[PDB]
Amino acid sequence: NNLGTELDYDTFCFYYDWYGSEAIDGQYRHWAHAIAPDPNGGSGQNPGTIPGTQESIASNFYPQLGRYSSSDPNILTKHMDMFVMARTGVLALTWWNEQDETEAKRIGLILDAADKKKIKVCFHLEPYPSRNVQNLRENIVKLITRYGNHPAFYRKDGKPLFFIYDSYLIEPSEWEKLLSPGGSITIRNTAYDALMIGLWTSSPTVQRPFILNAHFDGFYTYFAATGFTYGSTPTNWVSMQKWAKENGKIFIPSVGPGYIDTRIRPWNGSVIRTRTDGQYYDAMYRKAIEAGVSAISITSFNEWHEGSQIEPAVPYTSSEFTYLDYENREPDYYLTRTAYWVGKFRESK
Numbered sequence: 001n002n003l004g005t006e007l008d009y010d011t012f013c014f015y016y017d018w019y020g021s022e023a024i025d026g027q028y029r030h031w032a033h034a035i036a037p038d039p040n041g042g043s044g045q046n047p048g049t050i051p052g053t054q055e056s057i058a059s060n061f062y063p064q065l066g067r068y069s070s071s072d073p074n075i076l077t078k079h080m081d082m083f084v085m086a087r088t089g090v091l092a093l094t095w096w097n098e099q100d101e102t103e104a105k106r107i108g109l110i111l112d113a114a115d116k117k118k119i120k121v122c123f124h125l126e127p128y129p130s131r132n133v134q135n136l137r138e139n140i141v142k143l144i145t146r147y148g149n150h151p152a153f154y155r156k157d158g159k160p161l162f163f164i165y166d167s168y169l170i171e172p173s174e175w176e177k178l179l180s181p182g183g184s185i186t187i188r189n190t191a192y193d194a195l196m197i198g199l200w201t202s203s204p205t206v207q208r209p210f211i212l213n214a215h216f217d218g219f220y221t222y223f224a225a226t227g228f229t230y231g232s233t234p235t236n237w238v239s240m241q242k243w244a245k246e247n248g249k250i251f252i253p254s255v256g257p258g259y260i261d262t263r264i265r266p267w268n269g270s271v272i273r274t275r276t277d278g279q280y281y282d283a284m285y286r287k288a289i290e291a292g293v294s295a296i297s298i299t300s301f302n303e304w305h306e307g308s309q310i311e312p313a314v315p316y317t318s319s320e321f322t323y324l325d326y327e328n329r330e331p332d333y334y335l336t337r338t339a340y341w342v343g344k345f346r347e348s349k
């Protein structure tokens with residue numbers, strides 16, 4: 001078929017599975033969240049917590065689906081239908097190495113639901129405690145062993161793909177052990193080889209040798225807020241792509257519809273990026289496509305704390321907070337606008 005509605009398997013949407021309800025999980029997990037103290041605000045702060053009541057949740061926006069559980073198979077069905085509407089073929093699942101049965105259950109449910117809609121799943125490896133290249137290898141082996149034969153497990157030209165958040169927390173000399181073909185604990189040429197996509201943060205003078213010396217297969221930028229880092233400044237994307245092509249690396253720029261995290265980080269208002277009825281998202285997505293990249297990542301499906309979500313949001317005013325909403329746009333606007341951009345991306349590919 002050539003309908004302009006099919007999923008794109010070079011489009012990765014960052015997905016969070018940490019939401020809970022009292023009924024399913026025992027607590028409205030993540031809807032309730034600690035408020036971060038101001039890192040520049042001195043001692044004795046007692047910032048408090050957002051309780052995750054119906055009236056007061058840990059987001060500046062409010063989900064159409066309410067205070068949902070990421071373990072609810074019925075929510076997962078709805079999310080997969082939202083991915084189909086957005087044309088986003090790959091769900092990039094946050095992974096925190098919780099080593100708990102409720103994690104394991106959730107991952108299986110997500111894979112199952114994704115497969116019903118021909119969506120694929122890859123893992124976004126977060127900065128879990130004592131993360132290092134040895135336990136990363138062990139975890140990559142575990143994930144490929146547990147999930148690699150699931151029909152929804154993502155591969156690109158035969159290889160799994162992992163995004164590695166805050167990959168700069170690990171020295172290139174350690175990464176080389178895992179990612180060079182000659183490395184002491186290499187995954188190259190093994191059953192556990194994968195495309196490893198590191199987080200490009202700062203200036204080229206630092207990041208170019210880091211990526212090369214660490215032997216990453218590519219890089220992404222994550223942040224939805226333009227200008228937060230060099231990497232998340234879209235005017236740099238043409239030159240980042242040129243370098244990537246010259247050095248055999250895969251650049252997967254991250255685009256998002258806005259940013260606001262001031263319910264949980266009230267001191268972080270300088271990072272706010274206004275959605276302007278979709279114009280911010282359009283500008284950022286256009287820059288990614290114009291850079292001539294092979295793959296794009298979306299920050300985010302549902303990082304509600306950071307206000308980067310494309311998941312449907314609804315107007316809501318409670319006695320405790322007046323939420324932001326999609327303003328002049330309908331709740332599913334960011335899903336259908338994603339589909340528009342996926343089409344433009346495919347037209348350019």
Ligand SMILES: OC[C@H]1CN[C@@H](O)[C@@H](O[C@H]2O[C@H](CO)[C@@H](O)[C@H](O)[C@@H]2O)[C@@H]1O
Pocket residue numbers: 094124126127165303305306
């Ligand atoms: O997925 C990468 C990165 C994206 N921003 C945050 O989701 C971050 O997690 C940390 O912040 C959230 C609140 O925004 C918090 O709930 C988590 O426990 C982390 O501290 C992700 O690593």
